[PDB]
Amino acid sequence: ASVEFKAGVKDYKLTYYTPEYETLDTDILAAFRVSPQPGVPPEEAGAAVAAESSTGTWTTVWTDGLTNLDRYKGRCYHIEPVAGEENQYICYVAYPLDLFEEGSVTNMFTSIVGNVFGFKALRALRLEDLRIPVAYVKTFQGPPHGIQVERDKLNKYGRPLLGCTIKPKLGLSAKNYGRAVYECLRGGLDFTKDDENVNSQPFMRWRDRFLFCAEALYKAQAETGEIKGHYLNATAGTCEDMMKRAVFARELGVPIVMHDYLTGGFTANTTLSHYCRDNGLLLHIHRAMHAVIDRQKNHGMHFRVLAKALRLSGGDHIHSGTVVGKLEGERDITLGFVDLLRDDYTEKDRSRGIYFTQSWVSTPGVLPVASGGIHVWHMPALTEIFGDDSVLQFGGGTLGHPWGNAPGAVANRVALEACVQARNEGRDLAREGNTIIREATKWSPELAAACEVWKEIKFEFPAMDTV
């Protein structure tokens, strides 16, 4: 049956707040921290978010009668007030599966996040968590290779993988850029890194850097006898240029390339991830700009939402935070989204930030990457927090050693391996971490040098996003 068209504005809650709704397993579910402006009922605020992210608008349109809106409408099925807060609520919105284009993180964000945060009626809006149904998950390709295949392709088992980021961030020539990679890689570091801001520039053009970085990584591999990578940055202004860099790295036979998925955009990242799957190339993802979106509790999107999206879009590595480094990192929040990237199934844990249970129907895992203001003293904590399946990156740590790169690499390699031994032998890394570091200095000339340079360095500022 059908109801007559009656022109005029009606309250959103009349059709879009549905506390009686039982969520279908196919629906995309969304957890929003909602701050209504004064005079706005929490129910109207939650129904406004669900409307203008799915099918609704500000006034009644006759064309609603041609479709079955109740079938396609996004719905606010729950409102829960936030602890210690007045006029802030947690609103759960369920979106039907038909609203979403298969295989597109772009489309998913366009609907869920596209216009709602700008509404005059809301003081603030934050997306804390998304429950992606398994049937939507299947439509994405996911990581090109994933945790298992990457370890198998690099033949590296039993420890976190080790990297350093070349510094200075910008300004180095291509020859000098390469000389740094060889020196770093010979000391035992598994990976060297192009900086995220290093694309192609007047100081260093990308092809020269690609070529020189290639020579350096192979020479280091022959000396070491251990497989080595250097992440080459395909981040570019156009897709054509992005591809051009990805094809050259394929000509060189190198194993890994990188992308900045947020500044490059999801459309480009999915395209690259599909190219890497087809040409055997590992894809490392840098999360540049995430803090513009994800630093504040009151407004934005949580990184757990953006991390999920990269697993769907595609990447073998994704930066995860260090907890102990210069950039913000909360142990319990991080520990939740490192599992969301790594495992097939995660139970809802409000203490660890997970608002919904998420299952990946065997979508491969993403390797969490820890980088930024971390030195050898941080190694025991890192190895415990992240576990074996992680990548540790010491740019300042490697190139800040007084003896040089090749020594600076040995220090971090000796540190991790000594930490790894202890955990295998039953020592507690948190309790004895410094004592394990201290034994290693006695047998390791390089690691000692590193340890005195950074003994007092610690980042201990109060955090802005707490659960």
Binding site: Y157, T224, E226, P402, R413, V420, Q421, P445
Partner: protein, 123 residues
């Protein structure tokens, strides 16, 4: 400042930069393997101890990642001693071969441990 050596500094992945393992240290490693419930297995190679590229240059392709398997992964093994005697049997038959102990996870089907356990002379 000390210069890291160039020559004869080939390495063996995890624990290779660490000082050489006592028989007690090796046993503690296989105890860590077994207590995690991973399945131990032993691998030997004589001719090509380090990775090379002969047949392809495609991304992610290398030779020498595959070593030969000594007998079969010891499924149903709870005894580190059985692993340790198995290493000894391999050495007697293959004294000139590199030999490594690995550990398999069935849940993720990824090796969860790899470490060199014996090296031929000169290495």
């Amino acid at each position: 400042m000390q210069v890291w050596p160039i020559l004869n500094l080939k390495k063996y992945e995890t624990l290779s930069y660490l000082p050489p393992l006592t028989t007690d240290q090796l046993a503690r490693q296989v105890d860590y393997l077994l207590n995690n419930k991973w399945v131990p297995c032993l691998e030997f190679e004589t001719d090509h101890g380090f990775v090379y590229r002969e047949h392809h240059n495609s991304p992610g392709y290398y030779d020498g990642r595959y070593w030969t398997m000594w007998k079969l992964p010891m499924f149903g093994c709870t005894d580190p001693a059985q692993v340790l005697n198995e290493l000894e049997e391999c050495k007697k038959e293959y004294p000139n071969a590199f030999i490594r102990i690995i550990g398999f996870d069935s849940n993720r089907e990824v090796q969860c441990i790899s470490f060199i356990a014996y090296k031929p002379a000169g290495y």
